[PDB]
Structure 1
Amino acid sequence: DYPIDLYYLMDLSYSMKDDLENVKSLGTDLMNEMRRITSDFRIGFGSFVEKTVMPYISTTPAKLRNPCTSEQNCTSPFSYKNVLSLTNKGEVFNELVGKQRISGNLDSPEGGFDAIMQVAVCGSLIGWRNVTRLLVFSTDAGFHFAGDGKLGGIVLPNDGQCHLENNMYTMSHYYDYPSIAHLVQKLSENNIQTIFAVTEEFQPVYKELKNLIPKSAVGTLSANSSNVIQLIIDAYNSLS
């Protein structure tokens, strides 16, 4: 049977307080489902909120520690953070997904395109192999792209190179958001198929994005995770 590799990109902005349980259930259902149709696979996951610059986050010293409300705790924002590299032992994946915590942010759209670019380009560090690759992207908000960074004083276009240090993105303040063409080119080169597990409200916009990115699918994120699971099954069964 065909081997498969899957990576789970989780959004952790503050708008995910109502969707964290669904994301965790989706992780623990992807693992226990794909460990039944392939028998030879590796998965890992990551997280992202937004760039750490003047406009996108609150720069006051008090809010850097707790970007959320004073009642909740929350963790300080981070542009991207690869938490678990690809591995086959499911207990590690379940335990690491079950301990994730939410983080704060100011503006409604989230900068997941930096995370997608880093996942696509940083090959050895994540653990990509010469095998069919899958990338599931969960989000409750919109997305930035090239041209937004000029608000924050960032003008250098994202060069598309790997800049991962200590399993964390460190050049967020230095490079602009990647344009849609850059993501299309990088994903088409790396042979990675993207499945967006977005919330129902953002179904239209992402669906339009599905037209731009070849070989991509969009499902819905909820307690009934069956849609994206069936999308994974369809993608797997269509290989030749």
Structure 2
Amino acid sequence: QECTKFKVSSCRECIESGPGCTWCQKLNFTGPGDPDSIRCDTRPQLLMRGCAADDIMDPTSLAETQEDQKQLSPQKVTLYLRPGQAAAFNVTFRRAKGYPIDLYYLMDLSYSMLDDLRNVKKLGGDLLRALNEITESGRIGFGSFVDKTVLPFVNTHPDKLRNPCPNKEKECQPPFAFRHVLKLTNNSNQFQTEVGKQLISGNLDAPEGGLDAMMQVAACPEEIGWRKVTRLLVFATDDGFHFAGDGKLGAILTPNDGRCHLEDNLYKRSNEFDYPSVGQLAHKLAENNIQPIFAVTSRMVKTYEKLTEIIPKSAVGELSEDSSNVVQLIKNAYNKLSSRVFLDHNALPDTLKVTYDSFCSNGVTHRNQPRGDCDGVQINVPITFQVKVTATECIQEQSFVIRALGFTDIVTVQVLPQCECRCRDQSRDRSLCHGKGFLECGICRCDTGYIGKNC
């Protein structure tokens, strides 16, 4: 409703000047004493000056979509953004048949997990059975963690580096940060034989270094052996976790670098890098599409539930003191993850603002939110997200993507400015401006040469 002018000299310079500015494309619209600045003003002011509605140039934002197997549609959208004016389009999510599942079992091997280890060693077949009950063609893997091997996270006395467990126990291995035990496989006997070799361990302080191991799992996809399917990372523990900052107690001041450091399937350089931050891990997990399942004991449940705020595609289930219920935990967690659908976008320049409206099938609706969010999403029951994109400037050609978190399918959004009036054909008006200059938008932009105004 408002048009501050500065030095408009053509139609594009008019539209760029403000969201409420419009341009009149009529011939001989200007009086001699008046400049061509007067062709730019608000719509009512231009109508007051006699411009017909069909000669008022007012570009408006626009969304065009190319659709082309129905989980995320459309796949390509083109946006023409008039500054200050939002363009809207709906993304339809149709939850498809579940993909195969790669489950990497990342287990805490502190001493209180001794009875847990005796059970997990015999659950290779139960885990693959469960994966092939949810979908088909499942694979399982295994890793273990304790903590960084420096004071005060472990006791560095040589007797206790040899036996971190209580002195009576002697099927105990030295402390270690992360060990990759089993590459993802459908062979339950490899699980039984390789996990069977693992001995219980120990450490000094209550929090542990499982976030280190999770970072290595996410940073080493070739060693872990992920397929391009559903990637579940079970994190089984009975304790809290260290994170960035805690390394200072052991004089570790270098941040986690987010790189793969597996040598001989061991995080050997773990005493060189501090623990990751939670956000850093949430970022690494979303990059590689790895969805963590925090299988923690009762007293840790509420602590690990707060992680689901930072890691959108994660879930928490209460693990037994001997881990004997872990299979139902995984089943419940898969339903928790798959019934929740987030629609989000990658990083944007400060010139674009994206908001989401969620039209969920479970009767819930959210409008104008920073992220699409629906719960209770059921197979083959479509939900809709209305995406609104607004630009503050006349932007340069640009693109970003929109994902349903937890899947690799994207909506590629091509973003173009709309600072150009698409004006009338100069046909029927040829003989032009009594000169060689050509017309654009009812205002003569004369070929250079003498120039001026009427030409």
Q: Same fold (TM over 0.5)?
A: yes
* The structure with more strand, counted as a fraction of residues: 2
> For residues 27 and 145 of structure 1, do their structure 2 counterparts lie closer, same or farther at Cα, with a shift above 3 Å needed?
farther
* The structure with more helix, counted as a fraction of residues: 1
Q: Bigger CA drift: 3-12 or 15-24?
A: 15-24
* Counterpart for residue 226 of structure 2: 128
Scaled by the length of structure 2, what TM-score is found? 0.50
Out of 205, 221, 224, the position equivalent to 1:107 is 205
Out of 332, 341, 344, the position equivalent to 1:230 is 332
The answer on 1:88 being equivalent to 2:186 is: yes
Percent identity for Structure 1 against Structure 2: 59
Give matches, 1:48-59, under 5 Å. 48-59=145-156
> For residues 182 and 156 of structure 1, do their structure 2 counterparts lie closer, same or farther at Cα, with a shift above 3 Å needed?
same
User: Residue type of the partner of 2:162?
Assistant: R
The answer on 1:189 being equivalent to 2:287 is: yes
The answer on 1:12 being equivalent to 2:109 is: yes
* Counterpart for residue 76 of structure 2: none
Count of aligned pairs: 240
Question: Given that residues 234 and 292 in structure 2 are in contact (C-alpha distance below 8 angstroms), is that contact kept between their aligned partners in structure 1?
Answer: yes
* 1: CA distance, partners of 2:124 / 2:237: 14
Structure number, greater radius of gyration: 2
Deviations 1:103-145 (A, max 9, x none): 0111011100110000001111111122221111100100000
Out of 73, 78, 88, the position equivalent to 2:176 is 78
Q: How far apart are residue 230 of structure 1 and its match?
A: 2.5
Matched residue SS, 1:171: helix
Q: How far apart are residue 218 of structure 1 and its match?
A: 0.4
* 2: CA distance, partners of 1:155 / 1:141: 24
Which runs of no fewer than 5 residues in structure 2 stay unpaired?
A: 1-96, 340-377, 381-455
CA RMSD of aligned residues (A): 2.0
Q: How far apart are residue 60 of structure 1 and its match?
A: 1.1
* 2: CA distance, partners of 1:227 / 1:67: 30
> For residues 208 and 135 of structure 1, do their structure 2 counterparts lie closer, same or farther at Cα, with a shift above 3 Å needed?
same
Deviations 1:22-55 (A, max 9, x none): 5446654322211334331222110010001121
The answer on 1:61 being equivalent to 2:158 is: yes
> For residues 24 and 151 of structure 1, do their structure 2 counterparts lie closer, same or farther at Cα, with a shift above 3 Å needed?
same
* 1: CA distance, partners of 2:158 / 2:122: 35
Question: Given that residues 30 and 229 in structure 1 are in contact (C-alpha distance below 8 angstroms), is that contact kept between their aligned partners in structure 2?
Answer: no
The answer on 1:34 being equivalent to 2:34 is: no
Question: Given that residues 22 and 221 in structure 1 are in contact (C-alpha distance below 8 angstroms), is that contact kept between their aligned partners in structure 2?
Answer: no
Out of 315, 318, 321, the position equivalent to 1:220 is 318
User: Residue type of the partner of 1:150?
Assistant: K
* 1: CA distance, partners of 2:233 / 2:325: 20
* 2: CA distance, partners of 1:28 / 1:201: 29
Which runs of no fewer than 5 residues in structure 1 stay unpaired?
A: none
Q: Which has the higher contact order (CA 8 A, sep 6+)?
A: 1
Give matches, 1:205-216, under 5 Å. 205-216=303-314
Q: How far apart are residue 78 of structure 1 and its match?
A: 0.9
Deviations 1:165-207 (A, max 9, x none): 1111111110000001100111111111111111111111111
* 1: CA distance, partners of 2:379 / 2:308: 20
User: Residue type of the partner of 1:219?
Assistant: G
* 1: CA distance, partners of 2:125 / 2:295: 15
